[PDB]
Amino acid sequence: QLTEEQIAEFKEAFALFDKDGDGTITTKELGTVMRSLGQNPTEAELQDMINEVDADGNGTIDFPEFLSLMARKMKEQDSEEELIEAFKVFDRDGNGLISAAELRHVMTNLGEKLTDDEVDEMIREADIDGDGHINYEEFVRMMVS
Ligand SMILES: [Ca+2]
Ligand SMILES: [Ca+2]
Ligand SMILES: [Ca+2]
Ligand SMILES: [Ca+2]
Ligand SMILES: [Ca+2]
């Protein structure tokens, strides 16, 4: 499941939070890590963050809990990065929007020679804000559906 080196890496990450090395991250120690990086969440906000990760409902995060989450997160990241890469290719001019001209061009490079009507239908179907283009959120919402 994990190598010793992965474990060690994860333990080093856990230690950043576990300011006192007691084997748990509290809402308070989370507050320290958030603050050091420029956020100042309320105790209510910290409690939600801990509650979302705290499996045994004991109020703090232990290493198996942290390890479990970071496996989740690292999957999510590999999913996301792929969606983002693909979007950026589709958006040839980098402007955050995939125009129909871009979509047609890249489809031609993917083996499909489409008409303007066909590509306009693809865009209509997926467009949410009405602008006749596809932004990242729109792009993701279609891809994962
Ligand atoms: Ca601690
Ligand atoms: Ca806040
Ligand atoms: Ca716990
Ligand atoms: Ca574009
Ligand atoms: Ca749009």
Swiss-Prot record:
Ca(2+) 4 binds at D127, D129, D131, H133, E138. Keywords: Acetylation, Calcium, Metal-binding, Methylation, Repeat. Ca(2+) 1 binds at D18, D20, D22, T24, E29. GO terms for cellular component: cytoplasm. Signal peptide: none annotated. The pantophobiac mutant CAM2 is undermethylated on Lys-113. GO terms for molecular function: calcium ion binding; enzyme regulator activity. Pfam families: EF-hand_7. The modification N6,N6-dimethyllysine is found at K11. The modification N6,N6,N6-trimethyllysine is found at K113. Ca(2+) 3 binds at D91, D93, N95, E102. The keyword Secreted does not apply. It comes from the Eukaryota. Residues 5-40, 41-76, 78-113, 114-145 form the EF-hand domain. Ca(2+) 2 binds at D54, D56, N58, T60, E65. InterPro entries: CALM/Myosin/TropC-like (IPR050230), EF-hand-dom_pair (IPR011992), EF_Hand_1_Ca_BS (IPR018247), EF_hand_dom (IPR002048). This protein has four functional calcium-binding sites. PANTHER family: CALMODULIN LIKE 3, MYOSIN LIGHT CHAIN 1, 3. Calmodulin mediates the control of a large number of enzymes, ion channels and other proteins by Ca(2+). Among the enzymes to be stimulated by the calmodulin-Ca(2+) complex are a number of protein kinases and phosphatases. Belongs to the calmodulin family. This is Calmodulin. It comes from Paramecium tetraurelia. The gene is CAM.
